[PDB]
């Protein structure tokens, strides 16, 4: 049929895989988790976990995507038994969109707040918000006595605006009674999905042309933000809050399980977008240096983002003598509540707010485009009938996403948003990457993987990467899954408590993605006629190796394959 | 490909088309609408409207289904412009299922109430029901003083059981706050859809074998019910309430618009099931006598059902000296509230309740099976790929119906149930039958229809049926649509009032089916390359007549075709 739509240049692929990993400052609280674990003695464990998690997994994803020349759905053509997981990493990705674009819509709403001269968070006098008239006191404008305020003060103008005008949480008591979607967030999501459709309908060319412009803004924005911070007096102390070096605070099973999830969610390994991007890349490329550069760029971006956030926190603590630890809202909209107020204190709040919201929209749109392109490529390579009708398929996917994201744009959508995000992302993606690592290291074998790499690359991976693929990565993923399952805490908002049935609904939604593996295994086992040893052979051997099944030449049954290093 | 799955015998087709039109006593209040219009001077207008509406439309549906040999989706192969409506009558049917099976589930629940020795409606002492403890007084067990009771008494044991144990309406204040689906109705709907899947997955053979047994029960049940009624003393007066002959009460625009909808909803003309059943019938059949027999059977069934209901009402009025007019609940579950209590007064309530619930389940399952088979046949004849995979398609349809019927099986589902039923059924089916009649009488022409009939039948329809098809039926349908649109009243429950946004949601849902015609017309007009006169010709001429389009031989453009009688 039609050949693969190769990228115009390697720079487009590089910028795309970079912009896919800049969502660390969107909704993820990186500096909060950094300060939570060992205070400032977090850099070394962070780097160690980042390496051992991403680099082997990123190299594996890139190599399996480039060599197989197909989407993540059929990327398991060498082992159909695990091919079911190829579906999982697709559907899970869609689940992410179900909330992700919603967050983007929130940022878009902030754009409509930045077009005016008087920002809504500057004045609490019913400026595009409906306060409860309980304590409408400016945190900086109205200077009053400093009190503990029950160690929780959610009456700040920015938080009030975010909760009343953006979320309308006051008209929703919980998750049992939700309500109706907001007309503003609905139009914002419509604009977002229309942009995504007009970008993805053509192919990878428009995607590259968009990420070539969108991914170049956050660097300049973070640079000018760090400059404006270091020019402010209250940043220095904030720096002291960023890295409070305490090697003795590294408690057992405290700093590791909280650092293994943030890097895993920020890098995006096993999410299915890497295979989709590698499927359109040239067959002759160096995934090693590209993966190293991507990991280093992601680490530097996380570091500078945490530094900027802690500088903003230090300047805010300089603005009001109350402590910044228990006064901030460590929720989904942490960047939407604390950061705008600082912009109110900075001169020329309009331009800074506009450029910050543009950076947020760009870094969200890039990740959403990548996540949707992964699903598109997977379902196109799986079903060839949908390969030619790319525009109609993209329109249908966007329409289904808009219809199924209404539960997240409503008044009480943030609760279901956090529920879906946490449960689905954590559980499903962890189980999927665990199954992928197992299938690649034990069933397919790292020897054939290294041979394919050496055939398509100028060198062969040494013993280090092979051991990391075989024994380090699967054991690490299994440990993370065991910690997430055993040490499971019931989900709860900052103040709101989730009902018991919500936890079971979240567990069912998360398990709906992981049960696709045994169902597909049973389907493949039943769709093959013959003896058990022949069905297992057809399931463990690649398609083009099926002729060996009649010859009874299977290396997986040999003990030398399981112990092959 | 595979030929048409012809029925085993004509008796199967007859029993199927009969059992499809026995849903008049399920949720439809036939005797209430009879007594509302002219009291007892309803038989003559009822018969006139029944004839003029069904017989021409039923003959047209049967002939168009038998001659075209295809489902309702592609039955417009002679005129693709109206082919869009072929989709409408499909989707609308599914909408009906979205509530219809739910009602069936209710009846199934009553079966679980009839298996016990002590019926729940007999004793109000918390017998499988949670009363509000306001007025737990037996209507017949506790003899008290007769009062007006504010002209509305909804505290009867049967109504209390139906509202608390079956619906759980007390935990739902309205439609803005719905809640969670009930676990009993969920399992009932699961059983219903599993039976529908195990019946429809094979084809028309199992459908005929099921309707050959299910459609034979309601006759015996109605016979024994009429016998037990005429043996009761209080039936005679009830008969006087059934037919109170008053020719002077036939007010203008009062008895016609209320009788034109009941017959139209009971007969089922234009619903799409008739074409689906005729598509599997032999090419040589007499649709005239079959349609006449079907109409006569439906009329006799409606008459005997109204007689039985009014006899039950008269016996209930004999049980308690209070009037039966304003004490009954004229809602969806009228047969579920008033009729069981009478069974409590009859000796051996167990057997009578069991056989009545079995009759209800059979007459609901037959109609649901027909409505789903219509959609199956339409989407199979439209997309040939789904023709071979009939079992998987039926499973998917049943699963989607079960997933989309959760809003009707919940605590507040009855409000959305009535909303969807009324809006969708009335508006969409009326617009669909109007468009079908117009396309058959004016665009295709009654002359070619009569010629095809004479080719496939032993005689040609006279001037009467041709005039009824051309000038009577379209004008009648247009008048009914105009009355429904202009004389539109806001929907409201017996006591609950619907919010304003619910009316707009219902209007949008109803219009979503009717907008499929202009969209499909525009799609067909844009999918044809050429001049406007050639596109119109391709849109109005049949497919096999497309060769005439190049010859510029189009009879529709001639004035003799529009005036052809």
First-to-last alpha carbon distance for chain A, in angstroms, is 38
Strand partners, A181: A410
The half-sphere exposure of B145 on its side-chain side, counting CA atoms within 13 A, is 3
The CA-based angle B358-B361-B364, given to 5 degrees, is 145
Number of neighbours of residue A481 by Cβ within 10 angstroms:
16
Number of neighbours of residue B212 by Cβ within 10 angstroms:
17
The half-sphere exposure of A426 on its side-chain side, counting CA atoms within 13 A, is 21
Residue A387 burial (CB < 10 Å; 0-12/13-18/19+)? middle
Closest CA to A148 of A329, A332, A325: A325
Measure the CA–CA gap between B389 and B382, rounded to whole angstroms: 13
Nearest CA in chain A to B175: A179
Residues 497-516 of A with CB under 8 A from B: 501
A383 touches chain B (CB under 8 A): no
Buried b (16+ CB within 10 A) or exposed e, A146-178: eeeeeeebebbbbbbbbbbbbbbbeebeebeeb
Nearest CA in chain A to B177: A177
Number of neighbours of residue A321 by Cβ within 10 angstroms:
7
Q: Residue A39: what are its φ and ψ, rounded to 5°?
A: 60, -110
Nearest CA in chain B to A385: B385
Q: Residue A181: what are its φ and ψ, rounded to 5°?
A: -65, 145
Pick the CATH number of A10-130+154-527 from 1.20.120, 1.10.1060, 3.40.1000, 1.20.1740: 1.20.1740
Residue B245: helix, strand or coil by DSSP? strand
Do residues A90 and A126 lie in contact, with contact meaning Cβ atoms separated by under 8 Å?
A: no
Put simply, the answer to whether B179 touches A179 (Cβ < 8 Å) is no
| Chain A residues touching B176 at Cβ < 8 A | 179-180
Beta strands in B263-326 (DSSP E): none
What are the residues whose beta carbons fall under 8 Å from the beta carbon of B148, sequence distance 6 or more?
none
What are the residues whose beta carbons fall under 8 Å from the beta carbon of B271, sequence distance 6 or more?
B89, B92, B93, B371, B374, B429
Do residues A18 and A297 lie in contact, with contact meaning Cβ atoms separated by under 8 Å?
A: yes
The label of the residue with tokens 């015609």 reads B517
Residue A557: helix, strand or coil by DSSP? coil
B176 touches chain A (CB under 8 A): yes
Residue B113 burial (CB < 10 Å; 0-12/13-18/19+)? buried
Measure the CA–CA gap between A408 and A417, rounded to whole angstroms: 5
Measure the CA–CA gap between A265 and A490, rounded to whole angstroms: 20
Measure the CA–CA gap between B371 and B95, rounded to whole angstroms: 10
Residue B102: helix, strand or coil by DSSP? helix
What are the residues whose beta carbons fall under 8 Å from the beta carbon of A310, sequence distance 6 or more?
A31, A35, A238, A239, A241, A242
Q: Residue A492: what are its φ and ψ, rounded to 5°?
A: -155, 145
Nearest CA in chain B to A505: B180
Strand partners, A243: none
The CA-based angle A518-A523-A527, given to 5 degrees, is 150
Number of neighbours of residue B429 by Cβ within 10 angstroms:
25
Beta strands in A173-303 (DSSP E): none
Could you give the C-alpha distances from A349 to A117, A119, A127, A355, A465, in angstroms and in order? 9, 8, 16, 10, 49
Do residues A498 and A490 lie in contact, with contact meaning Cβ atoms separated by under 8 Å?
A: yes
Closest CA to B429 of B297, B261, B548, B563: B261
The label of the residue with tokens 């910044």 reads A324
Number of neighbours of residue A375 by Cβ within 10 angstroms:
26
Residue B268 burial (CB < 10 Å; 0-12/13-18/19+)? buried
The CA-based angle B442-B57-B546, given to 5 degrees, is 40
* Tokens representing residue B93 in the block: 């049917």
Measure the CA–CA gap between B316 and B293, rounded to whole angstroms: 34
Closest CA to B13 of B274, B391, B269, B299: B274
Chain Cα centroid distance, residue B551: 45
Measure the CA–CA gap between A188 and A412, rounded to whole angstroms: 17
Cα dihedral sign for B119, B122, B124, B129?
positive
Q: What is the Rg, in whole angstroms, of the alpha carbon atoms belonging to chain B?
A: 24
What are the residues whose beta carbons fall under 8 Å from the beta carbon of A563, sequence distance 6 or more?
none
The CA-based angle A12-A13-A17, given to 5 degrees, is 120
Closest CA to B306 of B341, B343, B362, B266: B266
Strand partners, A492: A497
To the nearest 10°, report the CA torsion of B11, B12, B17, B20.
Answer: 140
* Tokens representing residue B361 in the block: 């389940």
Residue of B173, B174, B176 to mutate when probing chain A, most A C-beta within 10 A: B176
Helices and strands counted in chain B (H then E): 27, 0
Buried b (16+ CB within 10 A) or exposed e, B136-172: eeebeeeeeeeeeeeeebebbbbbbbbbbbbbbbeeb
Measure the CA–CA gap between A89 and A82, rounded to whole angstroms: 12
Beta strands in B419-535 (DSSP E): none
Closest CA to B89 of B294, B331, B382, B317: B382
Could you give the C-alpha distances from B323 to A59, B139, B153, B310, B313, in angstroms and in order? 83, 13, 12, 13, 10
Measure the CA–CA gap between A80 and A86, rounded to whole angstroms: 10
The label of the residue with tokens 């669909």 reads B432
The CA-based angle A278-A280-A285, given to 5 degrees, is 55
Question: How big is the A-B interface in CB pairs under 8 Å?
Answer: 7
* Tokens representing residue A405 in the block: 């994201």
Measure the CA–CA gap between A355 and A340, rounded to whole angstroms: 12
Secondary structure (H, E, C), B108-162: HHHHHHHCCCCCCCCCCCCCCCCCCCCCCCCCCCCCCCCCCHHHCCCCCHHHHHH
* Tokens representing residue A64 in the block: 């399996």
Measure the CA–CA gap between B446 and B469, rounded to whole angstroms: 7
Do residues A133 and A166 lie in contact, with contact meaning Cβ atoms separated by under 8 Å?
A: no
Measure the CA–CA gap between B433 and B57, rounded to whole angstroms: 9
Q: Residue B245: what are its φ and ψ, rounded to 5°?
A: -65, 110
Closest CA to B447 of B565, B539, B555: B565
Measure the CA–CA gap between B110 and B122, rounded to whole angstroms: 13
Domain boundaries defined on chain B: 10-527, 528-565
Measure the CA–CA gap between A342 and A318, rounded to whole angstroms: 11
* Tokens representing residue B125 in the block: 């002492």
| Chain A residues touching B180 at Cβ < 8 A | 176, 501
Residue A10: helix, strand or coil by DSSP? helix
Do residues B71 and B378 lie in contact, with contact meaning Cβ atoms separated by under 8 Å?
A: yes
The label of the residue with tokens 């003799």 reads B560
Closest CA to A18 of A159, A216, A196: A216
Helix locations, B20-42, DSSP H? 30-36
Do residues A97 and A189 lie in contact, with contact meaning Cβ atoms separated by under 8 Å?
A: no
Residues placed in the known binding site of A: 19, 21-23, 26, 35-36, 93, 97, 265-266, 298, 330, 366-367
Put simply, the answer to whether B176 touches A179 (Cβ < 8 Å) is yes
Closest CA to A228 of A124, A351, A398, A359: A351
Cα dihedral sign for A154, A155, A161, A166?
positive
Residue B183 burial (CB < 10 Å; 0-12/13-18/19+)? exposed
Put simply, the answer to whether A501 touches B180 (Cβ < 8 Å) is yes
Residue B181: helix, strand or coil by DSSP? strand
Do residues B340 and B121 lie in contact, with contact meaning Cβ atoms separated by under 8 Å?
A: yes
A396 touches chain B (CB under 8 A): no
Q: Residue A410: what are its φ and ψ, rounded to 5°?
A: -80, -170
Do residues B414 and B329 lie in contact, with contact meaning Cβ atoms separated by under 8 Å?
A: no
| Chain B residues touching A501 at Cβ < 8 A | 180
Cα dihedral sign for A537, A543, A545, A550?
positive
Measure the CA–CA gap between B373 and A510, rounded to whole angstroms: 35
* Tokens representing residue B270 in the block: 């234009």
Measure the CA–CA gap between A305 and A311, rounded to whole angstroms: 10
The half-sphere exposure of A82 on its side-chain side, counting CA atoms within 13 A, is 24
First-to-last alpha carbon distance for chain B, in angstroms, is 38
Number of neighbours of residue B3 by Cβ within 10 angstroms:
6
Left (φ > 0), alpha (ψ -120 to 50) or beta: where does B355 sit?
A: alpha
Measure the CA–CA gap between A242 and B256, rounded to whole angstroms: 80
Residue B204 burial (CB < 10 Å; 0-12/13-18/19+)? buried
The half-sphere exposure of A397 on its side-chain side, counting CA atoms within 13 A, is 30
Measure the CA–CA gap between A395 and A390, rounded to whole angstroms: 9
For residue A329, what is the DSSP state?
-
Residue A125 burial (CB < 10 Å; 0-12/13-18/19+)? exposed
Closest CA to B272 of B412, B401, B95, B145: B95
Is B12 labelled a binding residue?
A: no
Residue A181: helix, strand or coil by DSSP? strand
Closest CA to B315 of B338, B348, B282, B286: B338
| Chain B residues touching A180 at Cβ < 8 A | 176, 501
Measure the CA–CA gap between B545 and A93, rounded to whole angstroms: 49
Segment (H or E) for A335? helix A334-345
Nearest CA in chain A to B502: A180
The label of the residue with tokens 């990467």 reads A465
Nearest CA in chain B to A180: B176
Is B353 labelled a binding residue?
A: no
* Tokens representing residue A417 in the block: 């948003």
Residue A134 burial (CB < 10 Å; 0-12/13-18/19+)? exposed
Question: Could you tell me which CATH class the domain B10-527 is placed in?
Answer: mainly alpha
Residue A285: helix, strand or coil by DSSP? coil
Do residues B417 and B408 lie in contact, with contact meaning Cβ atoms separated by under 8 Å?
A: yes
Closest CA to A30 of A425, A335, A251, A428: A335
For residue B201, what is the DSSP state?
T
What are the residues whose beta carbons fall under 8 Å from the beta carbon of A366, sequence distance 6 or more?
A16, A19, A20, A22, A23, A210, A211, A214, A215
For residue A78, what is the DSSP state?
T
Do residues A272 and A72 lie in contact, with contact meaning Cβ atoms separated by under 8 Å?
A: yes
| Chain A residues touching B179 at Cβ < 8 A | 176
Measure the CA–CA gap between A172 and A169, rounded to whole angstroms: 5
Do residues A19 and A211 lie in contact, with contact meaning Cβ atoms separated by under 8 Å?
A: yes
Number of neighbours of residue A508 by Cβ within 10 angstroms:
11
Put simply, the answer to whether B176 touches A176 (Cβ < 8 Å) is no
User: Nearest-CA distance from A180 to chain B in Å?
Assistant: 8
Measure the CA–CA gap between B465 and A535, rounded to whole angstroms: 65
Number of neighbours of residue B101 by Cβ within 10 angstroms:
28
Farthest CA pair distance, chain A: 85
Could you give the C-alpha distances from A69 to A63, A478, B156, in angstroms and in order? 10, 29, 70
Cα dihedral sign for A481, A482, A483, A484?
positive
């Amino acid at each position: 049929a039609q050949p693969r739509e190769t990228w115009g240049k390697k720079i487009d692929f590089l910028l795309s895989v970079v912009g896919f990993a800049v969502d660390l400052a969107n909704v993820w609280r990186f500096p909060y988790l950094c300060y939570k674990n060992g205070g400032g003695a977090f850099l070394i464990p962070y780097t160690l976990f980042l390496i051992i998690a991403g680099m082997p997994l990123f190299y594996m994803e890139l190599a399996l995507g480039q060599y197989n020349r197909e989407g993540a759905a059929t990327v398991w053509k060498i082992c159909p038994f695990f091919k079911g997981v190829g579906y999982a990493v697709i559907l899970i990705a869609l689940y992410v969109g179900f909330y992700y674009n919603v967050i983007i819509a929130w940022s878009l709403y902030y754009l409509f707040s930045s077009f005016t001269l008087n920002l809504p968070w500057t004045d609490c006098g019913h400026t595009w918000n409906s306060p409860n008239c309980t304590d409408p006191k400016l945190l900086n404008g109205s200077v009053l006595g400093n009190h503990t305020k029950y160690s929780k003060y959610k009456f700040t103008p920015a938080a009030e605006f975010y909760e009343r005008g953006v979320l309308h949480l006051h008209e929703s008591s919980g998750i049992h009674d939700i309500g109706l979607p907001q007309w503003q967030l609905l139009l914002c999501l419509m604009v977002v999905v229309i942009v995504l459709y007009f970008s993805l309908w053509k192919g990878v060319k428009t995607s590259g042309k968009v990420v070539w412009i969108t991914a170049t803004l956050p660097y300049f924005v973070l640079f000018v933000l760090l400059v404006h911070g270091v020019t402010l007096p209250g940043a220095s102390n904030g720096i002291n809050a960023y890295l409070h070096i305490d090697f003795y605070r590294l408690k057992e099973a405290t700093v590791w399980i909280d650092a293994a999830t943030q890097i895993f969610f920020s890098l995006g390994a096993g999410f299915g977008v890497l295979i989709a991007f590698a499927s359109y890349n040239k067959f002759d490329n160096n995934c090693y240096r590209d993966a190293l550069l991507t990991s280093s760029i992601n680490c530097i971006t996380s570091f500078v983002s945490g530094f900027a956030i802690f500088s903003i926190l230090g300047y805010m603590a300089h603005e009001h003598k109350v402590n910044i630890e228990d006064v901030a809202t460590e929720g989904a909209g942490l960047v939407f509540i604390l950061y705008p107020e600082a912009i109110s204190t900075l001169s020329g709040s309009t331009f800074w707010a506009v450029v910050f919201f543009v950076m947020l929209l760009a870094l969200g749109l890039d990740s959403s485009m990548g996540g949707m392109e992964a699903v598109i490529t997977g379902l196109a390579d799986d079903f060839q009938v949908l390969k030619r009708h790319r525009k109609l398929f993209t329109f249908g996917v966007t329409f289904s996403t808009f219809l199924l994201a209404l539960f997240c744009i409503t008044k009480g959508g943030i609760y279901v948003l956090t529920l879906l995000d946490t449960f689905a992302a954590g559980t499903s993606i962890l189980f999927a990457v665990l199954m992928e690592a197992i299938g690649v290291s034990w069933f397919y074998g790292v020897d054939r993987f290294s041979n394919d790499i050496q055939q398509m690359m100028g060198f062969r991976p040494g013993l280090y990467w092979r051991l990391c693929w075989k024994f380090v990565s699967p054991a690490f993923l299994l440990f993370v899954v065991v910690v997430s399952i055993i040490n499971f805490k019931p989900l709860t908002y900052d103040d709101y408590i989730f009902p018991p049935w919500a936890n079971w609904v979240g567990w069912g939604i998360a398990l709906s993605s992981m049960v696709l593996v045994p169902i597909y295994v049973i389907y493949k086992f039943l769709s093959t006629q013959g003896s058990l040893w022949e069905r297992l052979a057809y399931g463990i051997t690649p398609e083009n190796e099926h002729h060996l099944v009649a010859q009874r030449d299977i290396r997986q049954f040999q003990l030398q394959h399981w112990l092959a290093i």
